[PDB]
From a paper:
[name] (cyclin G-associated kinase) is a member of the NAK (numb-associated kinase) family, which in humans also includes STK16 (serine/threonine kinase 16)/MPSK1 (myristoylated and palmitoylated serine/threonine kinase 1), AAK1 (adaptor-associated kinase 1) and BIKE [BMP2 (bone morphogenetic protein 2)-inducible kinase]. [name] was originally identified as an association partner of cyclin G and CDK5 (cyclin-dependent kinase 5). It is essential for clathrin trafficking, mediating binding of clathrin to the plasma membrane and the trans-Golgi network, and regulating receptor signalling by influencing trafficking downstream of clathrin-coated vesicles. In addition to its role in the cytoplasm, [name] has important functions in the nucleus. It is required for the maintenance of proper centrosome maturation and progression through mitosis. Overall, [name] adopts the typical bi-lobal kinase architecture with most of the structural elements characteristic of kinases in both the N- and C-lobes highly maintained.
The asymmetric unit of the primitive monoclinic P21 crystals of [name]–NbGAK_1 contained two molecules of the complex, whereas the [name]–NbGAK_4 complex crystals exhibited a C-centred monoclinic C2 lattice comprising only one complex in the asymmetric unit. Although NbGAK_1 binds to the N-lobe, in particular β1, β2, β3, L23 loop and the hinge, the αH and αI helices are the regions in the C-lobe that are recognized by NbGAK_4. In contrast, a near complete kinase molecule (residues 25–334) was seen in the [name]–NbGAK_1 structure revealing that the structure of the folded form of the activation segment was reminiscent of the unusual activation loop architecture described for MPSK1. In contrast, although containing two molecules of the complex in the asymmetric unit, the limited intermolecular contacts suggest that the [name]–NbGAK_1 complex depicts the kinase in its monomeric active form. In this monomer, no activation segment exchange between the two kinase molecules is observed, and the activation segments of both kinase molecules are fully ordered, a particularly interesting feature discussed below. The structural changes are characterized by a major positional shift of the entire activation segment with a swing towards the C-lobe inducing an ordering of helix αG and the entire activation segment itself. The C-terminus of the activation loop thereby adopts a unique α-helix, a structural feature that has been predicted to be conserved within the NAK family. Interestingly, [name] mimics these interactions with a stretch of acidic residues in ASCH, in particular the central Glu217, which forms a salt bridge with the HRD motif Arg172 explaining why [name] is constitutively active and does not require phosphorylation of its activation segment. Interestingly, the indirubin E804 complex exhibits two binding modes which can be explained by the near-symmetrical core scaffold.
Numbering used by the authors:
A (entry chain C): 1 to 9, 11 to 34, 39 to 63, 66 to 72, 74 to 110, 111A, 111B, 111E, ...
B (entry chain A): 25 to 334
Write the structure that this text describes.
């Protein structure tokens, strides 16, 4: 069966940067359109970025345009998200899923994986 | 048809990659299409025919969809195209419909739930309320649009997990009011067009008996909705054997020893009235479902998450 594992999330200052990582197994990755999605408390799921199976196209939600960069390594079955110039609106649980979105940035597939927590705060340590 | 996968369809400013087949229903195919520039996913319905009667029926259906779009329970219309007989590869006139992408068919979701047992009352209320809410939007049009083919098979589950009406192939704005001025010729030609556009077990008393002076209008959808609510509650369709004598005489029975869907019993009886004029209006049905939902503290517009997560 399908397996997705995220990493790279953490507590970073506004204006900061992070690199998220996603490992896929259980399906033909080289042929799947892959997406980065986030769960935000009091909001729900929102689609963030997506990339074509061969990387010939990368798509982004307007709020992350010019700040985020989605990439993939079909050889190592890895998916990445370079986040920069981070905002508090970027705080959430980030997951990586197959396929794109429908209508108002709503993912086709709901995440089954653990996800990785991105917290855009100045706090010394986690609360 | 199957070979149309891997294609890059242009519909306005959109450039849809045809990804995979979702459904096949005669002369039409349903595919999962994805915009190459945005990543937004859609449903693409393809129809190949050179028959003028079909071309005219596609125009009507698409015109109803354009008008009904925007209701939370009507499938959202995005764009459509009609490529000519010469202008297509197949040599047939090509009809393309682009809508919002739904999770799947309601029928395939209920088939997975039967293993888990009978549906909860709250699940039934949401499925039913959202369906009636779609029909209400239709009957509210000027002129009213009568579906004529309401059944669980024509119901999809949206991305959010809400009911979506997708097919309007049998819908009409034409009501009939049979009289003591109608010929056998008229009666049979009327009976002919309605048999083609209905599911036999979902056929109404007013279309089985064209010698009752029962009007043939929006009340047809109420009878079909009475059948749906019976089907969701109990295992089977109230007239699954498709017997004309049972349908025309209203001979069905609510399971004598049920204590789970009692809340809906009154409504089933009120909707499955033999005379259409003695049947509830869609507004009365919606109002009664709203009260049931209120006395239970359920928002009936809510996602049917009981189906979705499996
Ligand atoms: O959006 C969709 N996601 C799906 C997943 C599985 C099967 C079908 C569909 C589907 C459909 N989206 C649309 C939009 C307009 C018309 C038909 C239609 C669809 N499927 O139709 C299949 C059942 C239908 O033939 C019942 O009348």
């Amino acid at each position: 069966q399908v397996q997705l594992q995220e990493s790279g999330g953490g507590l970073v200052q506004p204006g900061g940067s992070l690199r998220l990582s996603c490992s896929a197994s259980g399906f033909k990755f080289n042929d799947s359109y892959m997406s980065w999605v986030r769960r935000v408390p009091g909001k729900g799921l929102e689609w963030v970025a997506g990339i074509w199976e061969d990387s010939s196209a990368a798509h982004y939600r307007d709020s992350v345009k010019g700040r985020f960069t989605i990439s993939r390594d079909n050889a190592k079955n890895m998916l990445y998200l370079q986040m920069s110039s981070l905002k508090s609106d970027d705080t959430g649980l980030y997951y990586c899923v197959r396929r794109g979105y429908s209508g108002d940035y709503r993912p086709i597939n709901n995440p089954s994986s653990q996800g990785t927590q991105v917290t855009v705060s100045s706090a010394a340590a986690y609360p | 048809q199957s070979d149309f996968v891997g294609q890059t369809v242009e519909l306005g400013e959109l450039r849809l990659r045809v990804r995979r087949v979702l459904a096949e229903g005669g002369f039409a195919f349903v595919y999962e299409a994805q915009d190459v520039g945005s990543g937004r996913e859609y449903a693409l319905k393809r129809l190949l025919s050179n028959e003028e009667e079909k071309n005219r029926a596609i125009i009507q259906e698409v015109c109803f969809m354009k008008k009904l779009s925007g209701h939370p329970n009507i499938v959202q219309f995005c764009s459509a195209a009609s490529i000519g007989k010469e202008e297509s590869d197949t040599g047939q006139a090509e009809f393309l419909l682009l809508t919002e992408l739904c999770k799947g068919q309601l029928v395939e979701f209920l088939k997975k739930m039967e293993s888990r047992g009978p549906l909860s009352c709250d699940t039934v209320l949401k499925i039913f309320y959202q369906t009636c809410r779609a029909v209400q939007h239709m009957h509210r049009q000027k002129p009213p649009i009568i579906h004529r083919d309401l059944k669980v098979e024509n119901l999809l589950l949206s991305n959010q997990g809400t009911i979506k009406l997708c097919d309007f192939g049998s819908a009409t704005t034409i009501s009939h009011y049979p009289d003591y001025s109608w010929s056998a010729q008229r009666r049979a030609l009327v009976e002919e067009e309605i048999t083609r556009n209905t599911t036999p077990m979902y056929r109404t008393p007013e279309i089985i008996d064209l010698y009752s002076n029962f009007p043939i209008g929006e009340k047809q959808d109420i009878w079909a909705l009475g059948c749906i609510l019976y089907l969701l509650c109990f295992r089977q369709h109230p007239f699954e054997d498709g017997a004309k004598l049972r349908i025309v005489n209203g001979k069905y029975s609510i399971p004598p020893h049920d204590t789970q869907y009692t809340v809906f019993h009154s409504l089933i009886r009120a909707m499955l009235q033999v005379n259409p004029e003695e049947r509830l209006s869609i507004a009365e049905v919606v109002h009664q479902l709203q009260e049931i939902a209120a006395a239970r503290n359920v928002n009936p517009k809510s996602p049917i998450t009981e189906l979705l997560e499996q």
